[PDB]
Design an enzyme around this catalytic site. Structure first.
Site, PDB file in Angstrom:
ATOM      1  N   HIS A  35       0.815  -1.253   0.000  1.00 56.06           N
ATOM      2  CA  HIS A  35       0.000   0.000   0.000  1.00 56.06           C
ATOM      3  C   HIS A  35       0.834   1.282   0.000  1.00 56.06           C
ATOM      4  O   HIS A  35       0.314   2.361  -0.273  1.00 56.06           O
ATOM      5  CB  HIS A  35      -1.055   0.007   1.054  1.00 56.06           C
ATOM      6  N   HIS A  70       6.907   6.785   5.446  1.00 51.12           N
ATOM      7  CA  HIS A  70       6.376   6.355   4.153  1.00 51.12           C
ATOM      8  C   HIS A  70       5.714   7.554   3.517  1.00 51.12           C
ATOM      9  O   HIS A  70       5.505   8.565   4.244  1.00 51.12           O
ATOM     10  CB  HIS A  70       5.364   5.160   4.259  1.00 51.12           C
TER      11      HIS A  70
HETATM   12 ZN   LIG Z   1       0.655   7.503   6.193  1.00 48.45          ZN
END
Ligand SMILES: [Zn+2]
Ligand SMILES: [Zn+2]
Length: 258
Positions: A62, A92
């Site tokens: 993801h 991220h």
């Molecule tokens: Zn995040």
């Protein structure tokens, strides 16, 4: 089936498996700059990343996470609206298929090309897993990315993307210094929120920096080349891994600046 960002398992469907999706302290939100309350009681943030130890980078299906050693107080965040020490575990990004979208948070409805998330957990809870079950368990620094000049400090991240193209792949990623991703100013907005992806737990104090960092077009371009899918599966580009703004409800956004 399992959650993602497609038409069939996208944000609008998460509530069926994660009822907290419709909770009272969901993220992200739109930051209304004219209604955010300057609070001069907020301390300056303290970012101590000089001892940061990066270990690996992983495509989890993801996003891509850069993971750090959090077995000790090596990279911590303190001060700001926080009580206690928060240890960096991973960072991220969330990004778009086009430059006009991609960030989680918005500023007066303006969307940025991407949003970096530096995730920290409250050491009083002893481990990440316990910290996510507490209202003050995590601290997340969100940094917007606008497209303009290249960000030198991001390049090492960009160049390794080829090797973690598909879900479940990982690569050694040592000696990466997260200080190369901070803007010049640490002025921020803060509010009580949640994780922006399932399980959407309402355990985050969000610290959103006012100043965006710049990345080149070509840098953001390499992000869009990753895949949501695993190897040998039909190709689905990893793009638009972001969630629409959630209602503020009973919350106040405070500003560390005026
Ligand atoms: Zn995040
Ligand atoms: Zn919680």
């Amino acid at each position: 089936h399992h959650w993602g960002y497609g038409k069939h398992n996208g944000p609008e469907h998460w509530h069926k498996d994660f009822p907290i999706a419709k909770g009272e302290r969901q993220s992200p939100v739109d930051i209304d700059t004219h209604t955010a309350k300057y609070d001069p009681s907020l301390k300056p943030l303290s970012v101590s990343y000089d001892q940061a130890t990066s270990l690996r980078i992983l495509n989890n299906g993801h996003a891509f996470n850069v993971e750090f050693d959090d077995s000790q107080d090596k990279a911590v965040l303190k001060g700001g609206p926080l009580d206690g020490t928060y240890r960096l575990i991973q960072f991220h990004f969330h990004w778009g298929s086009l430059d006009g979208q991609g960030s989680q948070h918005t500023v007066d409805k303006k969307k940025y090309a991407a949003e970096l998330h530096l995730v920290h957990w409250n050491t009083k809870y002893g481990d990440f897993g316990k910290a996510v079950q507490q209202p003050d368990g995590l601290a997340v620094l969100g940094i917007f990315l606008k497209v303009g000049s290249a960000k030198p400090g991001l390049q090492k991240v960009v160049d390794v993307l080829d090797s973690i193209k598909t879900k479940g792949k990982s690569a050694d990623f040592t000696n990466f210094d997260p200080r190369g991703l901070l803007p010049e100013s640490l002025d921020y907005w803060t509010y009580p929120g949640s994780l922006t992806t399932p399980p959407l737990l309402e355990c985050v104090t969000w610290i959103v920096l006012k100043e965006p960092i710049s990345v080149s077009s070509e840098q953001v371009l390499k992000f869009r080349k990753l895949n949501f899918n695993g190897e040998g599966e039909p190709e689905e580009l990893m793009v638009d891994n972001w969630r629409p703004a959630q209602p503020l409800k009973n919350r106040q956004i405070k500003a560390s600046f005026k």
